[PDB]
A paper describes a structure:
The 10-subunit KMN assembly consists of three complexes, the 4-subunit [name] complex (MIS12C), the 2-subunit KNL1 complex (KNL1C), and the 4-subunit NDC80 complex (NDC80C) (Bharadwaj et al., 2004, Cheeseman et al., 2004, De Wulf et al., 2003, Desai et al., 2003, Kline et al., 2006, McCleland et al., 2003, Nekrasov et al., 2003, Obuse et al., 2004, Pinsky et al., 2003, Westermann et al., 2003, Wigge and Kilmartin, 2001).
From the results of limited proteolysis experiments (Petrovic et al., 2014), we engineered a deletion construct of the MIS12C in which three of the four subunits carried N- or C-terminal deletions. The resulting construct, referred to as MIS12CNano, did not crystallize, but addition of residues 1–71 of human [name] ([name]-C1–71), coupled with in situ proteolysis (Dong et al., 2007; STAR Methods), led to crystals. The MIS12C is an extended rod, with a long axis of ∼200 Å (1 Å = 0.1 nm), in line with the previous low-resolution EM analyses. The sturdy arrangement of helices in Head1 and in the helical connector of [name]:[name] provides a composite binding site for [name]. The main chain of [name] resembles a “horseshoe. Its first visible segment (residues 6–22) is extended and binds in a shallow groove between the α1 and α2 helices of [name] in Head1. The [name] chain bends again to complete its “U-turn” around residues 28–30, emerging in helical conformation (residues 32–44, Figure 2C; a more detailed description of the interaction is in the legend of Figures S3A and S3B).
Author numbering:
A (entry chain A): 2 to 200
B (entry chain B): 31 to 203
C (entry chain P): 6 to 22, 28 to 48
D (entry chain D): 116 to 155, 159 to 193, 203 to 245, 258 to 317
E (entry chain N): 32 to 204
Write the structure that this text describes.
């Protein structure tokens, strides 16, 4: 029992039972209003009578009797009609889900959720490292261009030196020197041999 | 498939049909005897005004609550959602008393798309860093193989030092 | 006058549900005419 | 010692009969409590009543012990009130959880939205960024390589004069053959 | 000591009702009593009577003065049902429009973190400290020096075998 109708009131903005209570305190008050109408109308009509009074505390208790009858039948009828109102209206048939919470049909586990947000932070930081990794690689390459050009420059100096050497006679001073000493070694050998003869 | 406004009007109309029937003229007469002996036509007029003003008053009340907060449009919306969804026949999702479960259920997709966005971005950055790093490695290969050639020709020029050595050796007595 | 029923319990002791039930006109006439006499 | 009226009688005859016996014994207790204050035998005419309607109290308790009004002493609005008072605290707790859970994300969104204005570890290529050779060392290596080049060049240009002196000396000595 | 000698009755109402029923006997006892004191002595007989009934009866292990009765009036039910309705419509409103505002905040902070992540793309790590350049002021000087030495040893190798020619020419006749 005791049904709060927490979903039936989510769509309407009020509990159906409270609305039925407001409807009741409306209808009953209207009934007693028309009873005040008939009572004071039979009271004003009473002043113009021949014979004796047959009134006024007598003519009121009768209105109280018919008022008790009307409260019985009106109360029962309102109870059944209110049950009807809570059955066919103001009721979410449980067959139907409101569009307010359309996505909550498929639940998402909390392990997958904490795992997912943790993976989100991890991938944020991971990207943040990959970016400056790109920056450092591009910087090391851009700076590496300079040392490559400098080594190419020194190699260009050595090639130009072998070109200035290739011209003027002696390409590389390796076969020349070993031929300069040998022909000199003879020039000394024939020098001594001509100093021993000149005596 | 009856509009809930029509069922409401039928419940009010039938409720009055059973109140005006329960409030029989005999029931208003046998108790209001003292008055009924004289002018049995004045009593009829008073009962008529009573019952008519009563039923028009209560019908005016329900007509006033239908315009209370646009309740006709609310009930028409409910009929719409019922017809729009009466295809499942299965018990719908009623909100369990765990706010974090529902909130995570609605928040899940907007976190999935973020996780996969950052996934694609970090994979693009990963591939770019891969190829770029390969270019760096090739550059290192080139600079080292250049240093080797510089040293090679340098030693090639330092080789004739010995040639000068035995040159000055044989040039001295 | 001024003597009435004032409590009117809002959520105390009443049964629940109805699905496809022959278009509920029958249940309209049947919810009335229950248990009451003068 | 009014409590002594309780333990006075009848533990084995259920509870309703003990309640009736409690009724009679309480009646006699009040009767005996009224006696010590009698001013004006007037005492003798009293018992003729007390015994009479005390016996009629015995037959009244014995009569309505059977019908049901006495045994109704020993046995749902309260249940639905309990379920309602549990529901209201459960929805209190849930309402608190919703308020706090909402303020959390509100101040989180305001904090992160007002926070951005007011080589790393675990990298993918972490091995490549750590095998970085010293390039300035290579530039200095060239700077001294050119110095070694100049000193070897000066050694050679010194040896060509070391030779030139011997060539002029030899070409002048061989001219002295005249 | 051994307690619960009092009659165990699960209802306080029945005791009061049957007690009010049997009060007419001790009320009838006041006939054989002087009219000077009959009224306060019947009040004393009543209070001591039903007092002796209550002190020797216990509801549910609870004394007559400390035991509550499950009889709720209409005021308690009106207040409790009022607060209950308040919390039903309140928790309903929370379930309805709270996940939407929370969704607004989280969907703001997600694209906010992505936006502050995009502005980080100018990481700009400087690096490349580098070194001092030595150009070619003496490089051309070393090349010209190598020209002088190269042609000098070329002419030396040209004129030395002529000196060997003059040498072996004077070694015979």
């Amino acid at each position: 029992s005791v049904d709060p109708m927490t979903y039936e009131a989510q769509f309407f903005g009020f509990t159906p039972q409270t609305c039925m209570l407001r409807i009741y305190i409306a209808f009953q008050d209207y009934l007693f209003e028309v009873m005040q109408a008939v009572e004071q109308v039979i009271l004003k009509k009473l002043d113009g009578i021949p014979d004796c009074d047959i009134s006024p505390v007598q003519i009121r208790k009768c209105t109280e009797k018919f008022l008790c009858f009307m409260k019985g039948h009106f109360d029962n009828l309102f109870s059944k009609m209110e049950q009807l109102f809570l059955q066919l209206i103001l009721r979410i048939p449980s067959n139907i889900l409101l569009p307010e919470d359309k996505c909550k049909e498929t639940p998402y586990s909390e392990e997958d959720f904490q795992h997912l947000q943790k993976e989100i932070e991890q991938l944020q930081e991971k990207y943040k490292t990959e970016l400056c990794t790109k920056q450092a690689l591009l910087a090391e390459l851009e700076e590496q261009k300079i040392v490559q050009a400098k080594l190419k420059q020194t190699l260009t100096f050595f090639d130009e030196l072998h070109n200035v050497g290739r011209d003027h006679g002696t390409s590389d001073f390796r076969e020349s020197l070993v031929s300069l000493v040998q022909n000199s070694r003879k020039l000394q050998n024939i020098r001594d041999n001509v100093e021993k003869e000149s005596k | 498939t009856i509009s809930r406004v029509k069922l409401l009007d039928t419940m009010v109309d039938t409720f009055l049909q059973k109140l005006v029937a329960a409030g029989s003229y005999q029931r208003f007469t046998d108790c209001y005897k003292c008055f009924y002996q004289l002018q049995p036509a004045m009593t009829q007029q008073i009962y008529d005004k009573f019952i008519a003003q009563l039923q028009t008053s209560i019908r005016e009340e329900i007509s006033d609550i239908k315009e209370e907060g646009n309740l006709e449009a609310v009930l028409n919306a409910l009929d719409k959602i019922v017809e729009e969804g009466k295809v499942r026949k299965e018990p719908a999702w009623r909100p369990s008393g765990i706010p974090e479960k529902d909130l995570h259920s609605v928040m899940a997709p907007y976190f999935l798309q973020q996780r996969d966005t950052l996934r694609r971005h970090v994979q693009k950055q990963e591939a770019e860093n891969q190829q770029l790093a390969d270019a760096v490695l090739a550059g290192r290969r080139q600079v080292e193989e250049l240093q080797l050639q510089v040293q090679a020709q340098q030693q090639a020029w330092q080789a004739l030092h010995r040639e000068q050595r035995e040159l000055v050796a044989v040039l001295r007595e | 006058l001024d003597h009435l029923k004032n409590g009117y319990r809002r959520r105390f002791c009443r049964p629940s549900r109805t699905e496809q039930g022959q278009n509920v006109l029958e249940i309209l006439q049947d919810c009335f005419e229950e248990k009451s006499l003068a | 010692g009014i409590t002594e009226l309780s333990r006075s009688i009848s533990v084995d005859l259920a509870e309703s009969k003990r309640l009736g016996c409690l009724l009679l014994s309480s009646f006699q207790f009040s009767i005996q409590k009224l006696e010590p204050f009698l001013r004006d035998f007037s005492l003798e005419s009293f018992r003729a009543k007390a015994s009479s309607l005390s016996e009629e109290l015995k037959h009244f308790a014995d009569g309505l012990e059977t019908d049901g009004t006495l045994q109704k002493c020993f046995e749902s609005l309260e249940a639905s009130v309990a379920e309602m008072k549990e529901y209201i605290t459960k929805f209190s707790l849930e309402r608190q959880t919703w308020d706090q859970l909402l303020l959390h994300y509100q101040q989180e969104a305001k904090e992160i939205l007002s926070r951005g204005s007011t080589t790393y570890l675990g990298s993918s290529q972490n091995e490549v960024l750590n095998t970085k050779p010293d390039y300035q060392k290579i530039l200095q290596n060239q700077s001294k390589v050119f110095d070694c080049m100049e000193l070897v060049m000066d050694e050679l240009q010194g040896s060509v004069k070391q030779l030139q002196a011997f060539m002029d000396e030899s070409t002048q000595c061989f001219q002295k053959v005249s | 000591p051994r307690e619960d000698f009092r009659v165990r009755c699960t209802s306080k109402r029945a005791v009061t009702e049957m007690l009010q029923l049997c009060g007419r006997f001790v009320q009838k006892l006041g006939d054989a009593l002087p009219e000077e004191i009959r009224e306060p002595a019947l009040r004393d007989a009543q209070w001591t009577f039903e007092s002796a009934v209550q002190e020797n009866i216990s509801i549910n292990g609870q004394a007559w003065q400390e035991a509550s009765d499950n009889c709720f009036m209409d005021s308690d039910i009106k207040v409790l049902e009022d607060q209950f309705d308040e919390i039903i419509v309140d928790i309903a409103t929370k379930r309805k429009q709270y996940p939407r505002k929370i969704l607004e905040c989280v969907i703001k902070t997600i694209k906010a973190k992505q936006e502050i992540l995009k502005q980080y793309h100018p990481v700009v790590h400087p690096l490349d400290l580098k070194y001092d350049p030595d150009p070619a002021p003496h490089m051309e000087n070393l090349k010209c020096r190598g020209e002088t030495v190269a042609k000098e040893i070329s002419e030396a190798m040209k004129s030395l075998p002529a000196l060997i020619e003059q040498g072996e020419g004077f070694s015979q006749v």
